[PDB]
Design a protein around this ligand. Structure first.
Ligand SMILES: O[C@@H]1[C@@H](O)[C@H](O[C@@H]2CO[C@@H](O)[C@H](O)[C@H]2O)OC[C@H]1O
Ligand code: ZN
Ligand code: ZN
Length: 196
């Protein structure tokens, strides 16, 4: 955003900015700095981070087709994803467009694949126990769609992923937020992403 960046945010916060929901979450490790830009733009910069997840989108999500653009420059473990939550049942989900040094599906049984938006995604389910959530400390399932050819930018037809997860037997609840998220853990980097 250059100058166009808003005030720097360094602790967890949510809101709506220029018509877009934003969620910034950090566990407090290292330094993580988030800024809202014009329209659907956000930037995040991080240095020896703990866990963080940040981005812009909608709350609630409604399975829309997402177009996003920008750049994503991690040095270490980071994911660029369409990211969100359902409630009842509580579910955290990821449509991973790129990951850097660590595959977040490691150790999970692959449940199938989905072909959409000129790529192929492998489908996984995991579980988090006594973990942070949009409802507080909780246990919940995580659903994953992990693109086989990593990219930064393009179109994500989220309904195709949700349909594929349901066909694989993965139940979704009522939609809470859905954002184009930059995530990191014990890494550094920067990203500047615009949700169109
Ligand atoms: O909205 C926030 C969530 O993004 C946060 O989720 C943690 C995000 O990192 C993931 O690796 C974890 O599985 C997940 O627990 O929880 C807090 C909530 O306010
Ligand atoms: Zn990659
Ligand atoms: Zn490629």
């Amino acid at each position: 955003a250059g100058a166009g960046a808003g005030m720097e945010i360094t602790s967890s916060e949510t809101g709506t900015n220029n018509g877009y929901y934003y969620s910034f979450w950090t566990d407090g490790g290292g330094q993580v700095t988030y800024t809202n830009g014009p329209a659907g733009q956000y930037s995040v910069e991080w240095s020896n981070s703990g866990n963080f997840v940040a981005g812009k989108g909608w709350n609630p999500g409604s399975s829309q087709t997402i177009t996003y653009s920008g750049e994503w420059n991690p040095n270490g473990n980071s994911y660029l994803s369409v990211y969100g939550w359902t409630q009842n049942p509580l579910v955290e989900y990821y449509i991973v467009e790129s990951f850097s040094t660590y595959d977040p599906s490691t150790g999970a049984q692959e449940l199938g694949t989905v072909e959409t938006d000129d790529g192929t995604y492998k489908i996984y389910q995991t579980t988090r126990e006594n973990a942070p959530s949009i409802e507080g400390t909780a246990t919940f399932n995580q659903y994953w769609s992990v693109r086989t050819d990593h990219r930064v930018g393009g179109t994500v037809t989220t309904q195709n992923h949700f349909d594929a997860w349901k066909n694989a037997g993965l139940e979704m609840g009522t939609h809470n937020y859905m954002i184009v998220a930059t995530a990191g853990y014990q890494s550094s980097g920067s990203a500047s992403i615009t949700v169109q």
